């Protein structure tokens, strides 16, 4: 029915895990900081029209428990009718929040919705929420639980990606990320984090290593062979993929996504909601999809749902969880290398689990305007979520 438009898409810088700048900042404060920035960019915005606040969070415990989206509404002083809901779809929680917000606007039963995510992995580590897929032996034994890292090493083994192939993409991400910061591409979207006094805490993605060299990446040791041996997940993965003899462990801390803290916010609304509040639409949600692969289909599904092909997309944005996953995605769909993660990715700047989806979405909204391009496709990785946006 109604068309969903993106009016704002901001995010915080990503602070590193060890000796990080955002470790002293509560994750609730990361969201309130972005809410106050939206107020500064639109001082005469009737927040009573904001009907929901959807935040993705993969470890909603401790500082991230108790519906952190509702805490953000009350702490920031938003109207008590603005709702607030937390959801969790693992790494795709950030994009699922935006997709859900867009779907709630199409239904007509919601008008103006805030969406995004938050993850303070230095304060609330991954796995702090527990679960059944790992802490219930009967379920773990049956579903054959395997960490994503071993699956990444397995993909590089099946598809034939060498240690130098994944390290080549890691160098590619660090360069394109540094070039994007030096060119000022992120100047208007990355909102520096400050304390209650106004003092600067962080204003850049401090996980980046822009001086990364190909020889330095070769010196790093495989980081996911002490878990595959002591945990025995290698043998578990090969019990299903019985035609593979040995798993080639090629992923290190330099070619994988980084543990960081961050948050993002996207303001999705209808056409009438923007005209009533004087907001200029920056992009338009074309279609969304959800699928899964063998334990790319979500990307193919959103393309058929929007009546498009791979050639019709100007910019592809896939989360750099692991280098082998991107090389696989590029090889399966034959993606032109000059269209894939043009401003770097999680390998260089980090991967805040609950917020990554809304971060890489707002990255394409800016890059579409900077290049004056039309369409962009954002996807995240055994589930999968894909979204297509179009410049307005």
């Amino acid at each position: 029915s109604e068309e969903a438009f993106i009016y704002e898409a901001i995010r915080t810088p990503r602070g590193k895990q060890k000796n990080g700048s955002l470790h002293e900042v509560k994750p609730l404060s990361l969201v309130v900081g972005l809410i106050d920035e939206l107020r500064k960019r639109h001082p005469d915005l009737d927040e009573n029209l904001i009907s929901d606040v959807i935040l993705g969070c993969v470890s909603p415990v401790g500082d991230q428990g108790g519906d952190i989206a509702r805490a953000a509404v009350l702490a920031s002083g938003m109207p008590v009718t603005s709702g607030g809901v937390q959801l969790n779809r693992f790494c795709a929680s950030g994009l699922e929040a935006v997709n859900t917000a867009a779907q709630k606007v199409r239904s007509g039963w919601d008008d103006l919705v805030l969406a995004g995510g938050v993850e303070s992995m230095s304060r609330v580590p991954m796995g702090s929420d527990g679960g059944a897929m790992g802490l219930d032996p009967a379920t773990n034994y049956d579903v054959m639980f395997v960490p994503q890292s071993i699956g990444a090493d397995l993909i590089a083994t099946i598809e034939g990606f060498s240690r130098e192939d994944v390290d080549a993409y890691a160098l590619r991400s660090q360069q394109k990320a540094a070039e994007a910061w030096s060119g000022g591409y992120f100047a208007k979207s990355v909102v520096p984090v400050r304390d209650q006094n106004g003092l600067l805490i962080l204003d850049h993605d401090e996980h980046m290593r822009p001086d990364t060299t190909k020889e330095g990446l070769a010196k790093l040791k495989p980081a996911f062979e002490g878990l595959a041996a002591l945990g025995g997940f290698d043998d578990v993965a090969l019990q299903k993929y019985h035609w593979v003899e040995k798993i080639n462990h090629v992923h290190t801390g330099g070619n994988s996504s980084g543990i960081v803290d961050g948050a993002a916010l996207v303001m999705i609304g209808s056409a009438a909601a923007g005209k009533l509040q004087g907001l200029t639409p920056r992009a338009r949600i074309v279609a969304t999809a959800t699928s899964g692969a063998d334990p790319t289909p979500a990307t193919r599904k959103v393309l058929d749902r929007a009546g498009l092909t791979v050639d019709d997309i100007d910019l592809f944005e896939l989360n750099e969880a692991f280098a082998s996953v991107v090389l696989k995605f590029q090889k399966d769909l034959n993606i032109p290398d000059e269209k894939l993660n043009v401003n770097g990715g999680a390998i260089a700047m980090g991967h805040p689990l609950g917020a990554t989806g809304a971060m890489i979405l707002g990255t394409m909204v800016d890059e579409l305007e900077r290049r004056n391009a039309r369409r962009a496709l954002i996807t995240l990785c055994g589930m999968g979520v894909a979204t297509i946006i179009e410049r307005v």
Binding site: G127, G130, G134, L135, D136, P137, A138, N140, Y141, M144, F145, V146, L227, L230, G231, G232, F233, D235, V236, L238, Q239, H242, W243, V244, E245, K246
Partner: protein, 729 residues
Amino acid sequence: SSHHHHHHSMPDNTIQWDKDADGIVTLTMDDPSGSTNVMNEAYIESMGKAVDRLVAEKDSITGVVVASAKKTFFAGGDVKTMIQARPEDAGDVFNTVETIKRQLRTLETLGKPVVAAINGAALGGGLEIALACHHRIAADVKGSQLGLPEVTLGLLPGGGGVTRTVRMFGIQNAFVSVLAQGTRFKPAKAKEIGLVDELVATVEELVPAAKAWIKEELKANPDGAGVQPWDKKGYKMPGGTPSSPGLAAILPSFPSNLRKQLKGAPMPAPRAILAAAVEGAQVDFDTASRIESRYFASLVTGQVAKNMMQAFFFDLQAINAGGSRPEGIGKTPIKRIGVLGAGMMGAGIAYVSAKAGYEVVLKDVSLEAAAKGKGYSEKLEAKALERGRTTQERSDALLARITPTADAADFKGVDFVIEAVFENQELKHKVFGEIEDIVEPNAILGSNTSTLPITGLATGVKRQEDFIGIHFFSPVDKMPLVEIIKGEKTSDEALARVFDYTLAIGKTPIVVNDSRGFFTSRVIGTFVNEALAMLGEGVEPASIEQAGSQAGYPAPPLQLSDELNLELMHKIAVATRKGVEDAGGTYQPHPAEAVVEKMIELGRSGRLKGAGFYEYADGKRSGLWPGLRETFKSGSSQPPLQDMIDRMLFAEALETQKCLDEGVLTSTADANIGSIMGIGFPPWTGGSAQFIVGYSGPAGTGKAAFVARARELAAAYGDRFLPPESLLS
């Protein structure tokens, strides 16, 4: 709520009540229907009365002592009853263990100290009765054992064993040390890990030391008397609960490490034990105990538990009770043993014979080779010395019984010969001919041959009544089966002398009639041939090995096909072809034979040559041969994994049925234990004969489902999977 099994409108009593002047009750279990105490219906009723009596007289009772009048303390559950439990009997099985544990829980939460007087074996349910007590005293006597070995029968400790061991040691320790493998500890080792608290010299000190501990406990610790550590407010589980941050970090690796150890085999008992332990640690003791009952009911009503209870209880006891042994012969002690050949077989036979305590003469062609054979025993003892298994004085006497020699006259005074030379009928005639007169007149002449018939080998000795086949399996120090082949001129006296010798060295014997291939070598050939046939058909070698491991074999077939030399598999192929062509018939070559010659032509005939299906460097195996995929065009055939698994299991099961039809095997008990302990048939099947009557799949269950699945395999992979008429009607 009730301590009894029935509550509506007569077994015999097994427990003797005795209250002393101090107020200490002594419960003495003494089942008059047998020689051991077992959780049968009589025990549940007897313990139900005693527990009801302890509650009615709690004002005049100060402590309880649980003891036994048998040589063993308590032998565990009633296997003869659990094996008959159908899936529809899950409610009766659940209520039974719930009633058994309700009695122990009342004995445990009595407010009075309870001491266990363990006078012998406390296995399975027996240890669970002791674990319900507050203090355990064991008599350090010869033959005493303690443990929870129901995992070896496809079950789990369903009388509180899982719930209490986790409460005492934590999830990780209780599972690894006690529960997962069901190891049986001696009283010295039992006190070290924490299953037993105190030890005494003799059994007459047990009850006095029990009452002495009750008296001291009441005076020293009056508040905590009769209260288990987990029945206290400040209880903290060792290693933490699953919600603890430390344990929750390594907890996801527990099911994966279990799949790594089991290699994906369909054995549900370790999975159920691990689930009951972790799930139980999240709730209170009583709720945890009920979760333990539900997992116990799922295993007993299952088929895998019935297969293991058939093999590792009934079939194994029938063998240990002279089931295959002759009936009229007596005993003949052995003085000095003579082993011919110093290879891995001959050296292994010398070690196990000296480890038992016999004098061994190890003869080879040269003194250099006979010393290298004794060095096999030295490097096993040197490894056992640094690990702490045996002592220095006991290991020196072990090697002192092994006398390496090269002269044939050193066999003077040998009443038991075990030949282990090269597979050649003319050579075995030559080696036996040199010594048949030097040895004692009434001496056993054993031949460790693989395929050559014993009837033909006996023509090289004068007294053929004492000639017999004694087939060991490499490595001899680990493999516990001895296949005793009975020739046509082999007497019954020599059949019993080897039977008693096999029991003397700590191994399990089976009796097999003479036939080319016997039972082990013939059946194990069909298993390795199916894999080699799959390799020739174009199946990925990694999938073939996975199919073998996930089937439940201890070694994947291609890896096993290298330990067994491909030159030997080529010689057996010519022998079977010669026996049919020269008799006026056309030979039907197995498709695996073509793969054997292709590997020999390439110069890869197993680990002995240093190259085979795997690559070998410095003796250590590492990786499949990269040229194996290009040689056989691997990848062009991708059958279902279960089809590969079934092709290996059915090839052995059908061939085992043929050995029963032709009279090669006398009983199915020998077929099961022989397949499990000899050729490594998966224990979850209960044997290659039980696999037919206990088959389970998507089609159905039983012999009918085995036949239908065999026909499904025969329609797509060859008529060799057709069931014999002995299985049809």
